[PDB]
Design a protein around this ligand. Structure first.
Ligand SMILES: Cc1cc2nc3c(=O)[nH]c(=O)nc-3n(C[C@H](O)[C@H](O)[C@H](O)COP(=O)(O)OP(=O)(O)OC[C@H]3O[C@@H](n4cnc5c(N)ncnc54)[C@H](O)[C@@H]3O)c2cc1C
Ligand SMILES: NC(=O)c1ccc[n+]([C@@H]2O[C@H](COP(=O)([O-])OP(=O)(O)OC[C@H]3O[C@@H](n4cnc5c(N)ncnc54)[C@H](OP(=O)(O)O)[C@@H]3O)[C@@H](O)[C@H]2O)c1
Ligand SMILES: [Mg+2]
Length: 257
């Protein structure tokens, strides 16, 4: 009664560390884009569950998840072996802090992510309502290597032409991939590129200010710590709590061991 069992519909491995899967969505699972649920498997006769951002949008028929693969991680050491037709467990009470309703009004929305932390923004960039709220939405995704830029084709080619969303996306979404460990046009960590001025110059926007710029952050605990400092120094005020407005919102992409 705490979870539903759903059939897996697709599985795609981007790298040795990242994969995407989709599954049937229960008719009762309503959610706000950006929220997370619990996802898992039956293991040793009991559910084995972990928090996962819903990567699909709430208007989409199926669920999508973007997942790490940790070879000695209790869940994903098993989850990495999903096949089409397998069963996964999905919980029933979505929650989380990455909800657009909690943002103060602004002109620009920075979606700042590393690694699998792009996951809630796969959902939010498919929310038609976010595009009316901002003049520009800047999806920043930092990863180690070019191969780790999962969804590169979605954001450079597909989404601007989307039959439902393209008229909203094409003039407003700016995709800013960052690669830290090999040659690339945006090189290093998003924190350094924001402080140095390079990110703003590349995208053609003015420096972040408290009147115009809002953000959502999803990444490692260390990335959140460093990125919060950057935004605080720019003069932004974090939301103190779910349901309370702020200039920016944060959520941990995982918990350190
Ligand atoms: C709010 C929230 C949302 C989350 N959403 C997602 C999501 O959409 N996709 C996802 O892959 N994970 C997500 N995570 C992490 C997820 O809950 C699990 O940690 C993940 O499924 C790994 O589970 P595990 O049992 O295999 O390993 P764990 O025992 O949970 O972790 C093992 C090791 O891997 C590290 N680790 C775990 N997950 C990640 C990750 N995603 N990226 C980098 N290092 C990681 C841990 O810090 C630890 O060192 C989320 C976590 C939280 C708190
Ligand atoms: N070997 C690989 O090619 C590869 C690729 C992906 C995932 N993985 C594995 O998967 C797990 C998770 O790795 P991940 O790469 O997804 O996550 P990650 O270690 O958090 O790194 C993702 C990106 O975030 C950057 N970053 C790290 N700390 C930061 C901070 N404080 N502020 C801003 N940016 C920061 C990293 O830059 P830096 O390069 O400076 O660390 C990298 O570009 C690990 O076990 C890892 O070994 C490995
Ligand atoms: Mg819904």
């Amino acid at each position: 009664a705490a979870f539903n069992t759903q059939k897996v519909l697709s599985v795609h491995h981007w790298t040795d560390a990242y994969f995407t899967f989709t599954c049937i969505r229960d008719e009762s699972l309503r959610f706000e884009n950006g929220q997370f649920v619990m996802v898992g498997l039956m293991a040793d006769g009991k559910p084995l569950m972990r928090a996962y951002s819903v990567a699909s949008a709430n208007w989409e028929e199926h669920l999508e998840f973007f997942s790490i693969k940790v070879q000695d991680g209790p869940l994903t050491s098993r989850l990495q072996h999903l096949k089409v037709g397998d069963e996964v467990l999905i919980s029933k009470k979505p929650t989380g802090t990455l909800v657009a309703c909690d943002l103060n009004p602004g002109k620009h929305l920075y979606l700042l992510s590393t690694g699998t932390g792009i996951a809630p923004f796969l959902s939010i960039t498919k929310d038609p309502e976010i595009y009316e709220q901002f003049e520009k939405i800047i999806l920043v995704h930092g990863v180690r290597y070019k191969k780790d830029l999962a969804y590169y084709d979605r954001f450079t080619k597909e989404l601007p032409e989307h039959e439902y969303l393209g008229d909203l996306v094409k003039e407003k979404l700016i995709y800013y991939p960052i690669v830290s460990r090999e040659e690339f046009e945006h090189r290093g960590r998003l924190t350094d590129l924001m402080v140095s001025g390079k990110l703003f110059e590349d995208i053609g926007l003015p420096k972040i200010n408290p009147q115009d710029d809002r953000a959502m952050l999803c990444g490692s605990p260390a990335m959140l710590k460093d990125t919060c400092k950057v935004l605080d120094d720019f003069g932004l005020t974090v939301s103190p709590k779910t349901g309370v407005r702020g200039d920016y919102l944060i959520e941990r992409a995982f918990v350190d061991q």
